[PDB]
């Protein structure tokens, strides 16, 4: 289930529209509740956004940093460090 | 349902229950601030006829783009931004605008420049921004700018830089259309015979690309114009329009329309149920008399 | 997390509010420009019935009413622009303005120069800074500190920056009225704004009222009107009246700004309007040097700079021009991709700026 | 019957939306969607007309002859006005000019149409009034034995939203009904000298009154039995819609010479 | 269904409870209104559009430190209590701004103007791309820039290209039309522009062809000199009044810059005054190369040959030539465009530019 959404990144390989569909998609994920879902989304977003960088994904993850759900903040910051990699510093500073 | 409702819908809502029970029609505000639609115009090329040089030119600049857009794009010519008509006054500057609009079957939208001169904060600015929105919905269109033109067909209106400021805005908007949208379906028509209403943006390429010449009538041409005006009404049937036409020299398309109306007062006095050839000769004599003024 | 806590706040707020609405419904029911209690069952005269409107009137001469505490009813309530007056149920503030202007409490721009504007800053210091810090000094002497200051030379010379900086230090409000906007062409409207700015000013006392450009409005009066000097003089003549007519000195400050010195009238020059003339016009060679030195501290730099040399290339400057030399010098470096600034860069920025200023 | 009876408010019908349902604007400022009677729905139903409204019912009580009034002072009707060829002799050019423009369509619409020339529908008169011009206007009305409706054209100038549009509408309607008729617009230059160059602002209220006059003026008078005569203290330019053919087609001069 | 329903039913339940309780109190018809001010007695005075006005209680949907005057709020029947807060309507970038969102063109498509492109960059594109120099150093990137060249020739191209590269709303103001010739219209128009821009930053205030408030006067009198001067002064004061490192960026545009006062440019905010140099030979190849892509033509055309005989001609000339050549093909009833056509268009435009006799060509 966690792995299903992880899998979708790899399925969305070589597919132009689908990369765009992700931005629609992670919208769906916010509607759906559950701790399993709330934990999974920083990771789902993180994987897609280091094989196809998304400004929207960074913009969301800043907010997740300052989250009162503990597990979510944890995963967001590791994820955020994943996006900033490839350089030392940027917006990441 | 919410897809019946929309922004700027007029609805009937119960004063009893506050439930939106039916939908009327959508409303607007620039359309009643001296801007107006005129569907399927009644002008033809025969109306101000003897436009031959212009006809081919005007067909390619305006009509071909509109009729066949894909063709312009692929060929390697972007659609012309504006046309300015320049030639003698009182011809059929306005008439031509309407004629072309009819031919392609597009909406003729007459804009009074000055009216677009409200003395409140932005209300004028607002109408100018909305003029483009409206015409984008209503595409295709000829957007004809009135009050930059001196014509005897309607009337010479406009003074100052109060329709030079407006005339500028129209040209920016064409840049804007090729710009972020990368479309153009809306062509803007200048007409003028005057040097104290021009812009330096008017003189500039990539801002307006065609200057198409408006001929003077001639003896052959006057006959064509005259012929149309006399066969929208009752006339004697042995008529030689050619004969009449030779008698007018110097006389614009607007004058050919005046000849018929002056001829008519003669017909009317003598209690005829048609006009005759006779009336038309006498009418030409009347106009020539005015031109010669001391 | 964030959602549950927002609902918890709504629920709590709401219950208090519902109860409070019903109580407001049972009684059948501060800035304000007329009072309007549209009923008044509760409350010469021995009871209030006060309602100030064209279409009707209810008139009682006597305010106060520590019990019930008056107010309530059809709510705009307090003192009147006719003086019948809601005197003291829920805070009136002397006919208090509902027409706004831009307030900037503590404007933030601290001390752009302190060297090479040395005298001009010091003028501000005596008038504005010290009378807020100690009112008693001024009092003991028996003097009243300059009511108004005129600042000349071109605007945006760092004229603004310095003014703002003393305002921060004292924790005082900038009250900005821009001369150019006032200009209406409808009967009396501008002068009306001026009266309410001063009524409002007296309430808010400890404030620098900034009047942008006297070239704009009040530029002549020798015409005896013209349609466009007639509202404009009306606004202008009204604005002076208010000033000599008294507003407190040593609290309320008015600062004027002007690019050109041909707009001024004898009416404008006089005390109780302008007392100070502070320069922000043309400084010295020693002076230009200090202002250069001051903007480039914050910057990294690589060695070989003498300010004196940079100063030398200016045949005449204004403060605006100086600010342009440091900032422009930095740009030549960034294009080459650099953090440091060099003697070459500073020279290059002088040459560009002065030459453009010409003509 | 009794339920729908006096007292009554006046409204105007704007348009019929569907069957048994119509939109009215009442004159107060409150607009209602109301029912029409089933025996008023067919064969007496006009798309805009003047109505009698009930103040509790919210239903079509009665349909009125169009002459519903305004908070501006009412206009003047003068059947056979008393100025009738006073000043004459030496006005030779201005008398002839009026005569073929103004008199003939009122007596016979039908000859103009048969020739196929447009009848003058509106005429513009320029040059002074009250010095030979007015006298002629009044005289023509009296000789054609049409109602003179003297219509105060600087009196739209009401300072409120639209009473004024409601009144023009009533007057053009009532003229076509009471044909032959002259609507005589005293100083048209009041409600139509505006924006030619972004000067003469402050004329936002007359812009609605102007649109209303054009729709009524051009949309009737197709054969011409009702004349509009425009009057200006000397001359003033007008906004382009009046001046073009189909409206003020004759432009008559009072001689300098 | 059933899988969903177990998470769903309580998640539904907390929102519904808040909602229920709100709607009962909130019950319609409730008038929408505007907060006039927020008061010292903790009341808010409101301006109701139904004509009364009131001193109103607040139900904390969001707090008062999160609410400011002129915001739209929903008001109860008589006492006008703030039952819930509303989002603002009719933001006025649809009335004083012609909007070109994500405008077209780029720096590669006119390239060969490369040295000037770096200049424009350094004030506008580059701070966005690399904040760090600007921050560390402590000096600011020029707020505003002036472009002088000519419409459809190089001025406009640079402006489209840069604005798109920074992904800011290009908001186009007609300078001359501000021009409104009555005492009330312009300075407000100008204020209203600057306001909306700073709110919804980063934003481009593009002022197209300002020529007519390019006068300064020593003394002001009457309405006929003062109007002009009020509009000029309003621009000058807003710049002087505020400072922004890129909440508001300005591009000012004019054909030549000798019709702008140096005391309206204002050094130290506007530090760059950037020129327009003509497309040289390399650039002509490029400008052409882009315009020949869109085309269907004959193979006898030599892009090279036509560039070489062109004497240092404007990018406008290059645009014009393509547009002109398509017409000579369309008239002849064909979609192929031969070399001879390009050459005729080139000969005609080259003559008009290079006409200036007895004072250029002495």
From Swiss-Prot, chain A:
PC repeats lie at residues 43-74. It comes from the Eukaryota. Present with 306000 molecules/cell in log phase SD medium. Belongs to the proteasome subunit S2 family. Acts as a regulatory subunit of the 26S proteasome which is involved in the ATP-dependent degradation of ubiquitinated proteins. This is 26S proteasome regulatory subunit RPN1. It comes from Saccharomyces cerevisiae (strain ATCC 204508 / S288c) (Baker's yeast). The gene is RPN1. The chain holds residues 736 to 828 of 993 of the full protein.
Curated annotation (Swiss-Prot), chain B:
GO terms for molecular function: ATP binding; ATP hydrolysis activity; proteasome-activating activity; protein domain specific binding; ubiquitin protein ligase binding. N-acetylated by NAT1. GO terms for cellular component: nucleus; proteasome complex; proteasome regulatory particle, base subcomplex; proteasome storage granule. Keywords: Acetylation, ATP-binding, Cytoplasm, Nucleotide-binding, Nucleus, Proteasome. ATP binds at residues 87-94. One of its GO terms (biological process) is proteasome-mediated ubiquitin-dependent protein catabolic process. It is found in: Cytoplasm; Nucleus. May form a homodimer or a heterodimer with a related family member. Interacts with OLA1, TMA17, and UBR1. Belongs to the AAA ATPase family. The 26S proteasome is involved in the ATP-dependent degradation of ubiquitinated proteins. The regulatory (or ATPase) complex confers ATP dependency and substrate specificity to the 26S complex. Present with 4700 molecules/cell in log phase SD medium. This is 26S proteasome regulatory subunit 8 homolog. It comes from Saccharomyces cerevisiae (strain ATCC 204508 / S288c). The lineage of its organism: Eukaryota, Fungi, Dikarya, Ascomycota, Saccharomycotina.
Swiss-Prot record, chain C:
Pfam families: AAA, AAA_lid_3, PRS7_OB. ATP binds at residues 153-160. Its main location: cytoplasm. Keywords: ATP-binding, Cytoplasm, Nucleotide-binding, Nucleus, Phosphoprotein, Proteasome. SMART domains: AAA. The modification Phosphoserine is found at residues 67, 134. Present with 105 molecules/cell in log phase SD medium. Interacts with UBR1 and CIC1. This is 26S proteasome regulatory subunit 7 homolog. It comes from Saccharomyces cerevisiae (strain ATCC 204508 / S288c) (Baker's yeast). The lineage of its organism: Eukaryota, Fungi, Dikarya, Ascomycota, Saccharomycotina.
From Swiss-Prot, chain D:
The keyword Nucleus applies. It is found in: Cytoplasm; Nucleus. The keyword Cell membrane does not apply. GO terms for cellular component: cytoplasm; nucleus; proteasome complex; proteasome regulatory particle, base subcomplex. N-acetylated by NAT3. There is a cross-link at residue 194 (Glycyl lysine isopeptide (Lys-Gly) (interchain with G-Cter in ubiquitin)). One of its GO terms (molecular function) is ATP binding. ATP binds at residues 127-134. One of its GO terms (biological process) is proteasome-mediated ubiquitin-dependent protein catabolic process. Keywords: Acetylation, ATP-binding, Cytoplasm, Isopeptide bond, Nucleotide-binding, Nucleus, Proteasome, Ubl conjugation. Belongs to the AAA ATPase family. The 26S proteasome is involved in the ATP-dependent degradation of ubiquitinated proteins. The regulatory (or ATPase) complex confers ATP dependency and substrate specificity to the 26S complex. This is 26S proteasome regulatory subunit 6B homolog. The lineage of its organism: Eukaryota, Fungi, Dikarya, Ascomycota, Saccharomycotina.
């Amino acid at each position: 289930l966690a792995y299903a959404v992880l899998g979708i990144a790899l399925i969305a390989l070589g597919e132009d529209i689908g990369k765009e569909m992700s931005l629609r998609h992670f919208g769906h994920l916010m509607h759906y509740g559950n701790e399993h879902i709330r934990r999974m989304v920083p990771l789902a977003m993180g994987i897609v956004s280091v094989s196809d960088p998304q400004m929207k994904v960074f913009d969301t993850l800043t907010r997740f940093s300052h989250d009162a759900d503990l597990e979510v903040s944890m995963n967001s910051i590791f994820a955020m460090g994943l996006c900033g990699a490839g350089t030392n510093n940027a917006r990441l500073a | 349902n919410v897809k019946d409702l929309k922004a700027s819908q007029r609805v009937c809502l119960r004063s009893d229950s506050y439930m939106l029970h039916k939908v009327l029609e959508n409303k607007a505000d620039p359309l009643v601030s001296l801007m107006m639609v005129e569907k399927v115009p009644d002008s033809t090329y025969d109306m101000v006829g003897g436009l031959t040089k212009q006809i081919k030119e005007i067909k390619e600049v305006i009509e071909l783009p509109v009729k066949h857009p894909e063709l312009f794009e692929s060929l390697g010519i972007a659609q012309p931004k504006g046309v300015i008509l320049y030639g003698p006054p009182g011809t059929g500057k306005t008439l031509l605008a309407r004629a072309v609009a009819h031919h392609t079957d597009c909406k003729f939208i007459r804009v009074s420049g000055a009216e677009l001169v409200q003395k409140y904060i932005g209300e004028g600015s607002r109408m100018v921004r909305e003029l483009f929105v409206m015409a984008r919905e209503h595409a295709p269109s000829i957007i004809f700018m009135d009050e930059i033109d001196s014509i005897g067909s309607t009337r010479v209106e406009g003074s100052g830089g109060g329709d030079s400021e407006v005339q500028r805005t129209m040209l920016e908007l064409l840049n804007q259309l090729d710009g972020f949208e990368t479309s153009k379906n809306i062509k803007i028509i200048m007409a003028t015979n005057r040097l104290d209403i021009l812009d330096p943006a008017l003189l500039r390429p990539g801002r307006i690309d065609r200057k198409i010449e408006f001929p003077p009538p001639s003896v052959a041409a006057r006959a064509e114009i005259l012929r149309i005006h006399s066969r929208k009404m009752n006339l004697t049937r042995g008529i030689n329009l050619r004969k009449v036409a030779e008698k007018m020299n110097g006389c614009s398309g607007a004058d050919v329309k005046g000849v018929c109306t002056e001829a008519g007062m003669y017909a009317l006095r003598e209690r005829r149920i048609h006009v005759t050839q006779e009336d038309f000769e006498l009418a030409v004599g009347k106009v020539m008399n005015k031109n010669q003024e001391t | 997390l964030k959602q549950t806590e927002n609902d918890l706040k709504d629920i709590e707020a709401r219950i208090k509010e519902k109860a409070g609405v019903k109580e407001s419904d049972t009684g059948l029911a501060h800035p304000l420009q007329v009072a309007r209690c549209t009923k008044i069952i509760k409350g010469e005269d021995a009871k209030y019935v006060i309602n100030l409107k064209q279409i009707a009137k209810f008139v009682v001469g006597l305010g106060e009413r520590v019990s019930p505490t008056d107010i309530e009813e059809g709510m705009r309530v307090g003192v009147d622009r006719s003086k019948y007056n809601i005197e003291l149920p829920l805070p009136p503030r002397i006919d208090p303005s509902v027409t706004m202007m831009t307030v900037e409490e503590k404007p933030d721009v601290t001390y752009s120069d302190v060297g090479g504007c040395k005298d001009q800053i010091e003028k501000l210091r005596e008038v504005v800074e010290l009378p807020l810090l100690s009112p008693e000094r001024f009092a003991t002497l028996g003097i009243d500190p300059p009511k108004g200051i005129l600042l000349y030379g071109p605007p945006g010379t760092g004229k603004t920056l310095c003014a703002r900086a003393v305002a921060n230090r004292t924790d005082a409000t900038f009250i900005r009225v821009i001369g150019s906007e006032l200009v209406q062409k409808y009967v009396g409207e501008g002068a009306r704004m001026v009266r309410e700015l001063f009524e409002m000013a007296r309430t808010k006392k400890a404030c620098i009222i900034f009047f942008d450009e006297i070239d704009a409005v009040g530029g002549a009066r020798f015409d005896d009107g013209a349609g466009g000097d007639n509202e404009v003089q009306r606004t202008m003549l009204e604005l002076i009246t208010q000033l000599d007519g008294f507003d407190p000195r040593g609290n309320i400050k008015v600062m004027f700004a002007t690019n050109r010195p041909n707009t001024l009238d004898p009416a404008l020059l006089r005390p109780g309007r302008i007392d100070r003339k502070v320069e922000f016009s043309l400084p010295d060679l020693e002076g230009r040097a200090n202002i250069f030195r001051i903007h480039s501290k914050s910057m990294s730099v690589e060695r070989g700079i003498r300010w004196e040399l940079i100063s030398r290339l200016c045949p005449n400057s204004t403060g605006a021009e100086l600010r342009s030399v440091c900032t422009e010098a930095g740009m030549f470096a960034i294009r080459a991709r650099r953090k440091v600034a060099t003697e070459k860069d500073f020279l290059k920025a002088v040459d560009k700026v002065i030459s453009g200023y010409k003509k | 019957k009794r339920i729908q009876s006096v007292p009554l408010v006046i409204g105007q019908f704007l348009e019929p939306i569907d069957q048994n349902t119509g939109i009215v604007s009442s004159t107060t400022g409150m607009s209602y969607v109301v029912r029409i009677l089933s025996t008023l729905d067919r064969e007496l139903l006009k798309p805009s007309m003047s109505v009698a409204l009930h103040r509790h019912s919210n239903a079509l009580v009665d349909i009125l002859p169009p002459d519903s009034d305004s908070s501006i002072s009412v206009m003047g009707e003068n059947e056979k006005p008393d100025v009738t060829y006073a000043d004459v002799g030496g006005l030779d050019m201005q008398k002839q000019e009026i005569r073929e423009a103004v008199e003939l369509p009122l007596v016979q619409a039908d000859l103009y149409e048969q020739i196929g020339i447009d009848p003058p529908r509106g005429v513009l008169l320029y040059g002074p009034p009250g010095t030979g011009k007015t006298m002629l206007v009044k005289a023509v009305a009296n000789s054609t034995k049409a109602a003179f409706i003297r219509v105060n054209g600087s009196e739209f100038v009401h300072k409120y939203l639209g009473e004024g549009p409601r009144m023009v509408r009533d007057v053009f309607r009532l003229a076509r009904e009471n044909a032959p008729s002259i609507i005589f617009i005293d100083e048209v230059d009041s409600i139509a000298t505006k924006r030619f160059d972004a000067q003469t602002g402050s004329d936002r209220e007359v812009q609605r009154i102007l649109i209303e006059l054009l729709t009524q003026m051009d949309g009737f008078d197709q054969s011409t039995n009702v004349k509009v005569i425009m009057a200006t203290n000397r001359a003033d330019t007008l906004d382009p819609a009046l001046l073009r053919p189909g409206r003020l087609d004759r432009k008559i001069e009072f001689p300098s010479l | 269904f059933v899988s969903n329903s177990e998470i769903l039913k309580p998640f539904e339940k907390k929102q519904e409870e808040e909602k229920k309780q709100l709607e009962e109190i909130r019950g319609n018809p409730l008038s929408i209104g505007t907060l006039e001010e927020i008061i010292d007695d903790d009341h808010a005075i409101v301006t109701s559009p139904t004509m009364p006005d009131y001193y109103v209680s607040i139900l904390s949907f969001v707090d008062k430190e999160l609410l400011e005057p002129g915001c739209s709020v929903l008001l109860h029947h008589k006492t006008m209590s703030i039952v819930g807060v509303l989002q603002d309507d009719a933001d006025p970038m649809v009335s004083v701004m012609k909007m070109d969102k994500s405008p077209t063109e780029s720096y590669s498509d006119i390239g060969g103007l490369e040295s000037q492109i770096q200049e424009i960059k350094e004030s506008v594109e580059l701070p966005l791309t690399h904040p760090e120099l600007y921050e560390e150093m402590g000096i600011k990137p020029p707020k505003g820039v002036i472009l002088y060249g000519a419409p459809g020739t190089g001025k406009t191209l640079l402006a489209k290209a840069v604005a798109n590269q920074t992904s800011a709303t290009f908001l186009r103001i007609v300078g001359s039309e501000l021009i409104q010739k009555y005492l009330g219209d312009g300075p407000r128009l100008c204020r209203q522009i600057f306001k909306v821009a700073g709110e919804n930053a980063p934003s481009i205030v593009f002022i197209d062809e300002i020529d007519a408030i390019g006068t300064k006067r020593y003394d002001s009198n009457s309405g006929g000199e003062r109007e002009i001067q009020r509009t000029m002064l309003e621009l000058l004061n807003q710049l002087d009044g505020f400072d922004d490192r890129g909440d508001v960026k300005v591009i000012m545009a004019t054909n030549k810059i000798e019709t702008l006062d140096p005391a309206l440019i204002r050094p130290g905010r506007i530090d760059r005054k950037i020129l327009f140099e003509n497309p040289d030979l390399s650039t002509k190849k490029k400008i052409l190369g882009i315009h020949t892509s869109k085309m269907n033509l004959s193979e006898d055309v030599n892009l090279e040959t036509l560039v070489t005989t062109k004497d240092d001609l404007s990018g406008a000339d290059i645009q014009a030539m393509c547009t002109e050549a398509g017409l000579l093909a369309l008239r002849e009833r064909r979609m192929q465009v031969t070399a001879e056509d390009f050459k005729q268009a080139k000969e005609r435009v080259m003559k008009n530019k290079v006409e200036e006799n007895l004072e250029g060509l002495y």
